[PDB]
Design a protein around this ligand. Structure first.
Ligand code: NA
Ligand code: NA
Length: 327
DNA sequence: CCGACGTCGCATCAGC
DNA sequence: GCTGATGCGA
DNA sequence: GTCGG
């Protein structure tokens, strides 16, 4: 399916999806619209009617009508009106700043703050996270070429081992699935001296080293188990400098690492197929563990997992490369 | 007819 | 000062 | 908004 097929409809739905989350604060309607956008995007036929589309899982009466209106006119009256609404479009925009959610974006537009300009005129009203998001508003909306991700992974794997060679680190996300680009970098971290049944400076020291070699530039949030911050490659001598990137590092217990690795590798749809799979075989998988039920449906103690493949074995199915994990 | 729709670590703030 | 709901991101 | 119990 090419974009030109039903891309006109998906954009309509994606726009509608954003206004639900950001303006109406109806997060479940937001996911509903996105779900429809996805299933339509995979649909290898130029849709001729709302009735044709309503056949698909995720699309019902109300969306079918909108598709009819779009097909008949080329536009949607409601979306047109809300694109042009000064309050709503401003609220919707401000949320594109990382750190600004639909709630904060509400109060800003309430007291008159609508634009990035206005945000810069009033930074003492922004918190630490929001200032970073504002500062790198453009960079964050860029994607990362796999080549840069590789160079980023190069730096991360090196400085981690340099801190302590017993560390294990794995860059997951769409990147591990061989994607040609990424939106950020998700690093999963563990150590033999960290288990579910067991220092509380393991995460700090990795972050510390990456700040020393000037790879990590800012910090959105940092606790004992998860780091959310900003990073940047060394500018290639005389050349044009790199965009700042979003990077997440989280520390996972050794006996939950590969379950964490499996989970955050994805994809989303792959993961649902594999956890619904799965119940049929009599196991429950979350991001942390895999547990056995249980004739009445009562889970037992989480089975030991020492590799990704280990999990596949439990549920009787031949190991899959991250490459082939899109569904 | 009406509830589920993913979940949770960290920063911030409301209540006390 | 402490407890913990809410906002936010993923 | 969609699905389904
Ligand atoms: Na349907
Ligand atoms: Na945001």
């Amino acid at each position: 399916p090419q974009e030109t097929l039903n891309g006109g409809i998906t954009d309509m739905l994606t726009e509608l999806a954003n206004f639900e989350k950001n303006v109406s604060q109806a997060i479940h309607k937001y996911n509903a619209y996105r779900k429809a956008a996805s299933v339509i995007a995979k649909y290898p036929h130029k849709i001729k009617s709302g009735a044709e589309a309503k056949k698909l899982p995720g699309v019902g009466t109300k969306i079918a009508e909108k598709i009819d209106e779009f097909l008949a006119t080329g536009k949607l009256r409601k979306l047109e009106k809300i694109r042009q609404d000064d309050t709503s479009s401003s609220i919707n925009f401000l949320t594109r700043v990382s750190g600004i959610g639909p709630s904060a974006a509400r109060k800003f537009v309430d007291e008159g703050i609508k634009t990035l300009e206005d945000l810069r005129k009033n930074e003492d009203k922004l918190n630490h996270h929001q200032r970073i998001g504002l500062k790198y508003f453009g960079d964050f909306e860029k994607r990362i070429p796999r080549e840069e991700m590789l160079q980023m992974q190069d730096i991360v794997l090196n400085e981690v081992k340099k801190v302590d060679s017993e560390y294990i680190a794995t860059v997951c996300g769409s990147f591990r699935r061989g994607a040609e680009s990424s939106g950020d970098m998700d690093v999963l971290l563990t150590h033999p001296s960290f288990t579910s049944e067991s220092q509380p400076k393991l995460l700090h020291q990795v972050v510390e080293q990456l700040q020393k070699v000037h790879f990590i530039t800012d910090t959105l949030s940092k606790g004992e188990t998860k780091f959310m911050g900003v990073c940047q490659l060394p500018s290639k001598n005389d050349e044009k400098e790199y965009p700042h990137r979003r990077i997440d590092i989280r520390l996972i217990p050794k006996d939950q690492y590969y379950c964490g690795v499996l989970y955050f590798t994805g994809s989303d749809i792959f993961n649902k197929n594999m956890r619904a799979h799965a119940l049929e075989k009599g196991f429950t998988i979350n991001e942390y563990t895999i547990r056995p039920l249980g004739v009445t449906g009562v889970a037992g103690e989480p089975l030991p997992v020492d590799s990704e493949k280990d999990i596949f074995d439990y549920i009787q199915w031949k190991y899959r490369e991250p490459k082939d994990r899109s569904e």
